[PDB]
Design a protein around this ligand. Structure first.
Ligand SMILES: C=C[C@@H]1[C@H]2CCC[C@@H](C(=O)N3[C@H](C(N)=O)CC[C@@H]13)N2S(=O)(=O)c1cc(Cl)cc(Cl)c1
Length: 127
């Protein structure tokens, strides 16, 4: 399925080139501009664990997740990943635990050492 495909066919977007965050662009967004550090970014997403379970979705809440890019308000992979996206883009991310919740996990939903899959849509970004 889509998690296997991004695992096997995604591009490494990490600065370290350690394959900790892999990406596939599913829908190309608008123009060339990506958000900048400190922008307010509006996204929709769905996340899955490696047991095949959906663990979260903003779509199901009927409103986007909003955060300030590049400030450590989210897992490292999200700061890195959303920074690569154009407005209107849909992407898949496959994230090793070192760029997510690590050995600690995040109870109750995220186990220790969890690889995460997301589908993410960048709705908008604003300074
Ligand atoms: C609104 C939730 C967000 C989501 C969406 C952004 C990615 C990631 C995340 O960085 N988060 C922040 C964090 N600093 O940890 C705050 C809470 C949590 N998650 S997540 O999808 O990985 C996630 C979902 C759920 Cl239901 C629980 C957790 Cl611990 C994480």
């Amino acid at each position: 399925g889509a998690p296997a495909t991004v695992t096997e066919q995604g591009e490494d977007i990490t600065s370290k080139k350690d394959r900790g965050v892999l990406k596939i662009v599913k829908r190309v967004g608008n123009g060339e501009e990506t958000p900048m550090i400190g922008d307010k970014v509006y996204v929709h997403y769905k996340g899955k664990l490696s047991n095949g379970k959906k663990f979260d979705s903003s779509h199901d809440r009927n409103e986007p997740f909003v955060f300030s890019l590049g400030k450590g308000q989210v897992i490292k992979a999200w700061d890195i990943g959303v920074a690569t996206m154009k407005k209107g883009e849909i992407a898949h991310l496959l994230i090793k635990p070192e760029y997510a919740y690590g050995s600690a996990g995040s109870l109750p939903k995220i186990p220790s050492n969890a690889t995460l899959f997301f589908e993410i849509e960048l709705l908008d970004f604003k300074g």
